[PDB]
Amino acid sequence: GPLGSMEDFVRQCFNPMIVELAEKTMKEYGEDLKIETNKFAAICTHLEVCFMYSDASKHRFEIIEGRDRTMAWTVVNSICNTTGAEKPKFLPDLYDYKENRFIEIGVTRREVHIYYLEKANKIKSEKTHIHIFSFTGEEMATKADYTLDEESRARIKTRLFTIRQEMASRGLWDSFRQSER
Ligand SMILES: O=C(O)/C(O)=C/C(=O)C1(Cc2ccc(Cl)cc2)CCN(Cc2ccccc2)CC1
Ligand SMILES: [Mn+2]
Ligand SMILES: [Mn+2]
């Protein structure tokens, strides 16, 4: 069985805007994508989940992820000052104008409950809502409030399953799955 290149997979299967944003994220944080290829794929995946989440209800969410860090904080600060929402310690992924809170989206190859608990421990912010997706279709969310309806979330999970499946088809999944953290 031939083993493909992860960089090849990423460029072939993600939208080039997502790829470009992922590249900029890596360069901004001092990482070489040509070595950290699995991480590159993870960043693309996470970005795409954030975009899909926002697109599940247009005009409802402000996107924070994918912006350069300074701009991301500028947007967070502006939202806080405008809405009175409390300022988070760490950069979140979205702001929910409807439920009036920031959202952290996690995408993991690990056990969802543990991943959730780790994120919730690190945020140190009872404000930011946490929503975790795994590639296995499992999910976990703050207060068992999943924000979006089953169909939107099904769309996200299906995309994740498709990614995992294409990766396994190229022999990329075994390494990707265990390179996390
Ligand atoms: O873990 C996430 O899903 C995620 O969005 C993390 C982040 O946005 C970082 C912000 C952050 C958010 C939450 C937590 Cl618990 C710790 C850090 C900022 C640099 N960011 C780069 C980055 C963005 C997305 C995916 C991986 C890395 C990482 C730290
Ligand atoms: Mn983020
Ligand atoms: Mn996130």
CSV table of C-alpha atoms and ligand atoms in Angstrom, one decimal:
chain,number,residue,atom,x,y,z
A,1,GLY,CA,0.0,0.0,0.0
A,2,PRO,CA,1.4,3.4,-1.0
A,3,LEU,CA,1.9,6.0,1.6
A,4,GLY,CA,1.0,9.5,0.4
A,5,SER,CA,2.3,12.9,1.5
A,6,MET,CA,0.3,14.7,4.2
A,7,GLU,CA,1.2,18.1,2.6
A,8,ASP,CA,-0.2,16.7,-0.7
A,9,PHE,CA,-3.4,15.6,1.0
A,10,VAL,CA,-3.9,18.9,2.7
A,11,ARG,CA,-3.4,20.9,-0.5
A,12,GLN,CA,-5.7,18.6,-2.4
A,13,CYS,CA,-8.5,18.4,0.1
A,14,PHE,CA,-8.8,21.8,1.8
A,15,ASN,CA,-10.0,25.0,0.2
A,16,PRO,CA,-7.0,27.2,-0.7
A,17,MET,CA,-8.2,30.1,1.5
A,18,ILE,CA,-8.1,27.7,4.5
A,19,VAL,CA,-4.7,26.4,3.5
A,20,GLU,CA,-3.4,30.0,3.2
A,21,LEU,CA,-4.8,30.9,6.6
A,22,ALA,CA,-3.2,27.7,8.0
A,23,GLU,CA,0.1,28.6,6.5
A,24,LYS,CA,-0.1,32.1,8.0
A,25,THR,CA,-1.0,30.7,11.4
A,26,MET,CA,2.0,28.5,11.3
A,27,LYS,CA,4.4,31.2,10.1
A,28,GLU,CA,3.1,33.6,12.7
A,29,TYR,CA,3.8,31.1,15.5
A,30,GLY,CA,7.2,30.0,14.3
A,31,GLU,CA,6.5,26.5,12.9
A,32,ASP,CA,7.7,24.8,9.7
A,33,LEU,CA,4.8,23.1,7.9
A,34,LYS,CA,7.1,21.0,5.9
A,35,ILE,CA,8.2,19.3,9.1
A,36,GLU,CA,5.0,19.6,11.2
A,37,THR,CA,2.7,18.3,8.5
A,38,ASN,CA,0.2,16.6,10.7
A,39,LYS,CA,-0.1,19.8,12.7
A,40,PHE,CA,-0.6,21.6,9.4
A,41,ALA,CA,-3.5,19.2,8.7
A,42,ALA,CA,-4.9,19.7,12.2
A,43,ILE,CA,-4.9,23.5,11.8
A,44,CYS,CA,-6.7,23.3,8.5
A,45,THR,CA,-9.3,20.9,10.0
A,46,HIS,CA,-9.9,23.1,13.0
A,47,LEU,CA,-10.2,26.2,10.8
A,48,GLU,CA,-12.7,24.4,8.5
A,49,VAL,CA,-14.8,23.3,11.6
A,50,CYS,CA,-14.8,26.9,12.8
A,51,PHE,CA,-16.0,28.1,9.4
A,52,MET,CA,-18.7,25.5,9.1
A,53,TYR,CA,-19.9,26.2,12.7
A,54,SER,CA,-20.2,29.9,11.8
A,55,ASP,CA,-21.9,29.1,8.5
A,56,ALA,CA,-24.5,27.0,10.3
A,57,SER,CA,-26.1,30.3,11.2
A,58,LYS,CA,-24.9,33.3,9.2
A,59,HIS,CA,-25.1,36.7,11.0
A,60,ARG,CA,-25.1,35.0,14.3
A,61,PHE,CA,-21.3,34.4,14.9
A,62,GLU,CA,-18.3,36.6,14.7
A,63,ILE,CA,-15.2,34.6,13.6
A,64,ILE,CA,-12.1,35.1,15.8
A,65,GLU,CA,-9.9,32.1,14.6
A,66,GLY,CA,-7.9,32.5,11.5
A,67,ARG,CA,-7.1,36.2,12.1
A,68,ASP,CA,-3.6,37.3,13.0
A,69,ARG,CA,-3.2,37.5,16.8
A,70,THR,CA,-3.2,41.3,17.1
A,71,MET,CA,-6.3,41.6,15.0
A,72,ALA,CA,-7.9,38.7,16.9
A,73,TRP,CA,-7.5,40.5,20.2
A,74,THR,CA,-8.6,43.8,18.6
A,75,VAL,CA,-11.9,42.1,17.6
A,76,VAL,CA,-12.3,40.4,21.0
A,77,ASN,CA,-11.8,43.7,22.8
A,78,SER,CA,-14.2,45.5,20.5
A,79,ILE,CA,-16.8,42.8,21.0
A,80,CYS,CA,-16.4,43.0,24.8
A,81,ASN,CA,-16.7,46.8,24.8
A,82,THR,CA,-19.7,46.7,22.5
A,83,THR,CA,-21.7,43.9,24.2
A,84,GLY,CA,-20.3,44.1,27.7
A,85,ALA,CA,-19.2,40.5,27.4
A,86,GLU,CA,-16.4,39.6,29.8
A,87,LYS,CA,-12.9,39.4,28.3
A,88,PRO,CA,-11.5,35.9,28.0
A,89,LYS,CA,-8.0,35.0,29.1
A,90,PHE,CA,-7.2,33.0,26.0
A,91,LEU,CA,-8.2,33.8,22.4
A,92,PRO,CA,-11.5,32.0,21.6
A,93,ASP,CA,-12.7,30.8,18.2
A,94,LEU,CA,-16.1,32.5,17.8
A,95,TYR,CA,-18.5,35.0,19.4
A,96,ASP,CA,-22.1,34.0,19.6
A,97,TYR,CA,-24.2,37.2,19.3
A,98,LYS,CA,-27.4,35.3,20.1
A,99,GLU,CA,-26.3,33.5,23.3
A,100,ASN,CA,-23.9,36.4,24.1
A,101,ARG,CA,-20.8,34.4,24.7
A,102,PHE,CA,-17.5,33.4,23.2
A,103,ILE,CA,-17.0,29.9,21.9
A,104,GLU,CA,-13.9,27.6,21.9
A,105,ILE,CA,-14.1,24.9,19.3
A,106,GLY,CA,-12.0,21.8,19.9
A,107,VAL,CA,-11.3,19.1,17.3
A,108,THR,CA,-9.5,16.0,18.7
A,109,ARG,CA,-8.3,12.5,17.8
A,110,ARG,CA,-8.2,11.8,21.6
A,111,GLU,CA,-10.9,10.9,24.0
A,112,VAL,CA,-13.5,13.7,23.9
A,113,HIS,CA,-14.3,13.8,27.6
A,114,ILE,CA,-10.7,14.1,28.6
A,115,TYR,CA,-10.0,16.7,25.9
A,116,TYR,CA,-13.0,18.6,27.1
A,117,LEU,CA,-11.9,18.5,30.7
A,118,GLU,CA,-8.4,19.7,29.8
A,119,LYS,CA,-9.7,22.6,27.7
A,120,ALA,CA,-12.2,23.5,30.5
A,121,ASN,CA,-9.3,23.4,33.0
A,122,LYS,CA,-7.1,25.7,30.9
A,123,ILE,CA,-9.7,28.3,29.9
A,124,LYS,CA,-10.1,29.3,33.5
A,125,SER,CA,-13.2,31.2,32.3
A,126,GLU,CA,-16.7,30.1,33.2
A,127,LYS,CA,-17.8,32.4,30.4
A,128,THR,CA,-16.5,30.9,27.2
A,129,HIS,CA,-18.6,28.0,25.9
A,130,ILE,CA,-16.7,24.9,24.9
A,131,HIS,CA,-17.7,22.6,22.1
A,132,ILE,CA,-15.5,19.6,21.2
A,133,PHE,CA,-15.8,17.4,18.1
A,134,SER,CA,-13.9,14.1,17.6
A,135,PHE,CA,-13.2,12.4,14.2
A,136,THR,CA,-15.3,9.5,15.5
A,137,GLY,CA,-18.5,11.5,15.6
A,138,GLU,CA,-18.4,12.0,19.3
A,139,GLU,CA,-19.0,15.5,20.7
A,140,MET,CA,-19.0,17.2,24.1
A,141,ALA,CA,-20.2,20.7,25.1
A,142,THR,CA,-20.5,23.0,28.1
A,143,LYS,CA,-23.7,22.2,30.1
A,144,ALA,CA,-24.8,19.8,27.4
A,145,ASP,CA,-25.8,22.8,25.3
A,146,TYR,CA,-24.8,22.0,21.7
A,147,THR,CA,-25.7,25.4,20.3
A,148,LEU,CA,-26.4,24.2,16.8
A,149,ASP,CA,-29.1,21.7,15.6
A,150,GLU,CA,-28.4,18.1,14.8
A,151,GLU,CA,-28.3,18.8,11.1
A,152,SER,CA,-25.5,21.4,11.3
A,153,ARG,CA,-23.5,19.3,13.6
A,154,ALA,CA,-24.1,16.3,11.4
A,155,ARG,CA,-22.6,18.3,8.5
A,156,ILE,CA,-19.5,19.0,10.6
A,157,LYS,CA,-19.1,15.4,11.7
A,158,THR,CA,-19.6,14.1,8.2
A,159,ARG,CA,-16.8,16.4,7.0
A,160,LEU,CA,-14.6,15.0,9.8
A,161,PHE,CA,-15.4,11.4,8.9
A,162,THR,CA,-14.6,12.2,5.2
A,163,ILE,CA,-11.2,13.7,6.2
A,164,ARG,CA,-10.3,10.6,8.4
A,165,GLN,CA,-11.4,8.3,5.5
A,166,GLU,CA,-9.4,10.0,2.8
A,167,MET,CA,-6.4,10.1,5.2
A,168,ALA,CA,-6.7,6.3,5.9
A,169,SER,CA,-7.1,5.8,2.2
A,170,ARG,CA,-3.7,7.4,1.7
A,171,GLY,CA,-2.1,5.7,4.7
A,172,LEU,CA,-1.9,9.0,6.6
A,173,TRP,CA,-4.4,8.3,9.4
A,174,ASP,CA,-2.3,6.2,11.7
A,175,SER,CA,0.4,8.9,12.1
A,176,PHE,CA,-2.1,11.8,12.2
A,177,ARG,CA,-4.2,10.1,14.9
A,178,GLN,CA,-1.3,9.6,17.3
A,179,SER,CA,0.7,12.8,16.7
A,180,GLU,CA,-1.9,14.8,18.8
A,181,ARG,CA,-0.5,16.7,21.8
B,1,LIG,O1,-7.0,24.5,20.6
B,1,LIG,C1,-7.8,25.1,19.8
B,1,LIG,O2,-8.7,24.5,19.2
B,1,LIG,C2,-7.5,26.5,19.5
B,1,LIG,O3,-8.2,27.2,18.8
B,1,LIG,C3,-6.3,27.1,20.3
B,1,LIG,C4,-5.9,28.5,20.1
B,1,LIG,O4,-6.6,29.3,19.3
B,1,LIG,C5,-4.7,29.1,21.0
B,1,LIG,C6,-5.7,29.9,21.8
B,1,LIG,C7,-6.1,29.0,22.9
B,1,LIG,C8,-7.5,28.6,23.0
B,1,LIG,C9,-7.9,27.7,23.9
B,1,LIG,C10,-7.0,27.2,24.8
B,1,LIG,CL1,-7.6,26.1,26.0
B,1,LIG,C11,-5.7,27.5,24.7
B,1,LIG,C12,-5.2,28.4,23.8
B,1,LIG,C13,-4.1,30.4,20.2
B,1,LIG,C14,-2.8,29.9,19.2
B,1,LIG,N1,-3.4,29.1,18.3
B,1,LIG,C15,-3.2,28.2,17.1
B,1,LIG,C16,-4.1,27.2,16.8
B,1,LIG,C17,-5.3,27.5,16.3
B,1,LIG,C18,-6.2,26.4,16.0
B,1,LIG,C19,-5.7,25.0,16.1
B,1,LIG,C20,-4.5,24.8,16.6
B,1,LIG,C21,-3.6,25.9,16.9
B,1,LIG,C22,-3.3,28.0,19.4
B,1,LIG,C23,-3.5,28.5,21.0
B,2,MN,MN,-8.6,29.3,18.3
B,3,MN,MN,-10.3,26.0,19.0
